[PDB]
């Protein structure tokens, strides 16, 4: 369970993400797909993309990043009270998309890496620990929903 102070560190770096969520999403997705190419495999709409240049030029990838980051931001803004938001996300990701929890950890690592690089002013050590705590809680709760939905 996060403290209010930890939530505020999460939300103050998210405020900078929101200056340009599309650009942040491109960086995060490119980082994810380069570090863990198997994640890109899971995304039939994007898996043809071969290079970073193609990824930066893909309007679908950009839109994908905006949708994903905006849904994560809505979860973070609930400061742990995110049961309603996780229900549909867990169901689609466990049952249709078939995204293992480990791939959500990979995505979490890409988020942290990009915030660290782009936002040293709001992603110092304490802020990065708060973000990690928030993403671990997200992953914990969505893993519990995965199990309830019949996926392990
Ligand atoms: C914080 C983590 C994530 C969030 C908040 C998130 C959010 C979303 C949202 C809002 C959608 C659209 C509605 C839906 O289908 O549920 C979506 C679709 C999708 N997501 Fe995720 N996602 C996350 C992680 C991932 C990861 C790591 C992968 C793959 C490695 C993934 C694969 C997909 C796919 C394949 C779709 C459908 C894309 C299509 O329409 O062609 N998601 N995600």
From Swiss-Prot:
Protein's UniProt keywords contain Oxidoreductase: yes
Gene Ontology cellular component list: extracellular exosome; sarcoplasm
Binding positions (heme b): 93
Subcellular location: Cytoplasm, Sarcoplasm
Amino-acid positions noted as binding O2 in the UniProt annotation, renumbered to this chain: 64
Any one GO BP annotation for this protein: removal of superoxide radicals
PROSITE patterns the record matches: GLOBIN
Modified residues (Phosphothreonine): 67
Oxidoreductase as UniProt keyword: yes
Binding annotation for nitrite: 64
Keywords (A to Z) from UniProt: Cytoplasm, Heme, Iron, Metal-binding, Muscle protein, Oxidoreductase, Oxygen transport, Phosphoprotein, Transport
Highest taxon listed in the record's lineage: Eukaryota
Gene Ontology molecular function, alphabetical: heme binding; metal ion binding; nitrite reductase activity; oxygen binding; oxygen carrier activity; peroxidase activity
Subunit structure: Monomeric.
Record-stated family: Belongs to the globin family.
Function (record text): Monomeric heme protein which primary function is to store oxygen and facilitate its diffusion within muscle tissues. Reversibly binds oxygen through a pentacoordinated heme iron and enables its timely and efficient release as needed during periods of heightened demand. Depending on the oxidative conditions of tissues and cells, and in addition to its ability to bind oxygen, it also has a nitrite reductase activity whereby it regulates the production of bioactive nitric oxide.
Protein name: Myoglobin
């Amino acid at each position: 369970v996060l403290s209010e102070g930890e939530w505020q560190l999460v939300l103050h770096v998210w405020a900078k993400v929101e200056a340009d969520v599309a650009g942040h999403g491109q960086d995060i997705l490119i980082r994810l797909f380069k570090s863990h190419p198997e994640t890109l495999e899971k995304i039939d709409r994007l898996k043809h993309l071969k290079t970073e240049a193609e990824m930066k030029a893909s309007e679908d990838l950009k839109k994908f990043g905006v949708t994903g980051l905006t849904a994560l931001g809505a979860i973070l803004k609930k400061k742990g009270h995110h049961e309603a938001e996780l229900k549909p996300l867990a169901q689609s990701h466990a049952t249709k998309h078939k995204i293992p929890i480990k791939y959500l950890e990979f995505a979490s690592e890409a988020i942290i890496h990009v915030l660290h690089s782009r936002h040293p002013g709001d992603f110092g050590a304490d802020a990065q620990g708060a973000m990690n705590k928030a993403l671990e809680l997200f992953r914990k709760d969505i893993a519990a929903k995965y199990k309830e939905l019949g996926y392990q």
